[PDB]
Design a protein around this ligand. Structure first.
Ligand SMILES: CCCCCCCC/C=C\CCCCCCCC(=O)OC[C@H](O)CO
Ligand SMILES: CCCCCCCC/C=C\CCCCCCCC(=O)OC[C@H](O)CO
Ligand SMILES: CCCCCCCC/C=C\CCCCCCCC(=O)OC[C@H](O)CO
Lengths: 14, 469
């Protein structure tokens, strides 16, 4: 799930 | 595994609008929470139990606004994590700690105000109770203990996304221990169940129990004003010994026998004199007995079931004065009350002998039917209970609204994201803007708590004007 770890790179911290 | 028609991205137009919003929430949150903590510290009339729990709520929000907005604003604009692995563990730990402080202080405030209704001294919020200090230290300790899994599980990932070097501060997908490997799976449900569903369910429960006891005190004040409170044994219009709010003791002509009936009813040797709290407990039993007879009465039960709480009190008021039979004789006015035809019923009831013989009491009860409020019986104690109920209702309403978007954005990510779809990547671009809006909203709770207290509390409104003068 590498499109997911890029999501967490752009996403907020929560 | 399947590819996607586009790169997960956020429009620069969005990044500039949201950042302006995040700047306003931060400045208003710091000012509002600091002044709120300032007026609670300065003014000595506001140094009580319930306000101390509010200060714990204010500090938790002041702590959250400090570590949430300034780092998510940077994460939006700079798109990288340059703070090392210590801040990657420290920031989410303090975040979940501060959030836990606010939801538990909210829960403690709802429990405290429910227990305070029974005593007039407590509902005024006078002084600081004993276990107030140890409750706060438990709230903060339990908050940081539950935030511990957030600290150890976070780390910096270094990966390759289409030839780009990425420093990603995140919760590591694979953990050493088995418990932490399980925490990473259902973390969003733990946040949704414990930091939203449980506080809303706990506060709504104790708020409901509080207003139910407030309802019983409204009716007692209503009947005390209309019928009268007698704390010494007296004879009614028929010569029978009576106490309290129209409570018949016995039909015996022996005052001494009547005194023993009183002692049986109060559970105390009263010598003919009872206290206001004993008359109230005796009155609450008379209401429950009156309601049981109404619900067993075929002509009053349908009307009573359809009425709201305030208007049910007005009907109980009439039964206390005239009895079940005499009230059931108002066959037409009762019909209009069941059809919610207030003004017509108000006009019809004013034609009665009841209105002609006791016009003052009748006007008050009719106004209660017409409006459905306690405006005809507004008194000193009702206002205090009314101010308390408004205070906790707005604080939990501000909480639920401010934390709904962020909690919503995480629960639809769990249930609608399917990594096998080809077009799923660009719905995260819509979740990207929701998760950043949900950060501004949850931070608005820090700003909306002082605004709510300013609008519902006369003392907070004046203390706020004093600090900004
Ligand atoms: C609509 C939701 C339905 C309700 C579901 C959620 C409410 C759970 C209630 C209690 C469990 C948590 C207890 C928290 C601590 C209780 C402290 C306490 O018991 O206070 C003493 C007071 O005298 C008591 O009347
Ligand atoms: C310009 C100054 C203000 C002027 C405005 C006047 C104030 C309105 C007050 C009550 C509304 C009365 C209607 C009540 C609405 C609820 C519907 C109802 O059923 O009540 C009437 C009853 O049904 C009859 O049979
Ligand atoms: C002619 C009029 C016909 C009908 C008149 C209806 C108009 C409502 C007026 C007074 C309601 C009094 C309620 C004041 C608040 C008491 C309840 C409370 O304190 O609860 C917190 C509240 O939910 C915080 O939003």
């Amino acid at each position: 799930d590498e499109e997911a770890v890029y999501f967490a790179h752009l996403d907020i911290i929560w | 595994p399947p590819p996607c028609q586009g790169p997960i991205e956020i429009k620069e137009t969005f990044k500039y609008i949201n950042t302006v919003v995040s700047c306003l929430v931060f400045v208003l949150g710091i000012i509002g929470n600091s002044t709120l903590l300032y007026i609670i510290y300065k003014n000595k009339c506001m140094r009580n139990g319930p306000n101390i729990l509010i200060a714990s709520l204010a500090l938790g929000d002041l702590l959250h606004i400090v570590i949430a907005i300034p780092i998510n604003v940077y994460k939006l604009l700079a798109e990288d994590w340059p703070f090392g692995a210590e801040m990657c563990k420290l920031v989410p730990f303090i975040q979940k700690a501060s959030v836990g402080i606010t939801v538990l202080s909210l829960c403690a405030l709802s429990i405290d105000r429910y227990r305070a209704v029974a005593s007039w001294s407590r509902i005024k919020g006078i002084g600081v109770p004993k276990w107030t200090a140890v409750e706060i230290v438990l709230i903060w300790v339990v908050s940081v203990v539950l935030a511990v899994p957030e600290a150890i599980g976070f780390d910096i990932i270094t990966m390759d996304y289409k030839g780009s070097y990425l420093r990603i501060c995140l919760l590591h997908p694979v953990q050493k221990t088995a418990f932490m490997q399980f925490y990473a799976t259902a973390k969003d449900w733990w946040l949704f169940s414990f930091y939203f569903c449980l506080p809303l369910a706990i506060t709504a429960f104790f708020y409901t129990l509080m207003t139910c006891e407030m309802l019983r005190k409204n009716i007692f004040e209503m009947l005390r004003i209309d019928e009268g409170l007698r704390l010494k044994i007296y004879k009614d219009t028929e010569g029978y010994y009576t106490i309290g709010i129209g409570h018949l003791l016995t039909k015996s002509p022996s005052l001494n026998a009547a005194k023993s009936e009183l002692d049986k009813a109060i559970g105390r040797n009263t010598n003919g004199v009872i206290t206001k709290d004993e008359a109230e407990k005796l009155f609450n039993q008379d209401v429950d007995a009156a309601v049981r007879g109404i619900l067993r009465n075929a002509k009053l039960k349908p009307v009573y079931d359809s009425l709201d709480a305030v208007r049910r009190a007005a009907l109980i008021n009439m039964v206390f004065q005239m009895g079940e039979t005499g009230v059931a004789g108002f066959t037409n006015s009762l019909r209009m009350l069941q059809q919610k035809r207030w003004d017509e019923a108000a006009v019809n009831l004013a034609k009665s002998r009841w209105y002609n013989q006791t016009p003052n009491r009748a006007k008050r009860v009719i106004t209660t039917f017409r409006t459905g409020t306690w405006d005809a019986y507004l008194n000193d104690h009702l206002k205090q209970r009314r101010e308390v109920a408004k205070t906790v209702f707005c604080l939990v309403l501000v909480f639920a609204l401010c934390w709904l978007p962020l909690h919503l954005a995480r629960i639809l990510k769990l249930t609608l994201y399917n990594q096998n779809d080809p077009n799923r990547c660009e719905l995260l671009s819509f979740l990207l803007v929701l998760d950043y809006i949900g950060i501004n909203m949850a931070s608005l709770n820090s700003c909306a708590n002082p605004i709510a207290l300013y609008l519902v509390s006369k003392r907070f409104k004046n203390a706020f004007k004093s600090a900004l003068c």
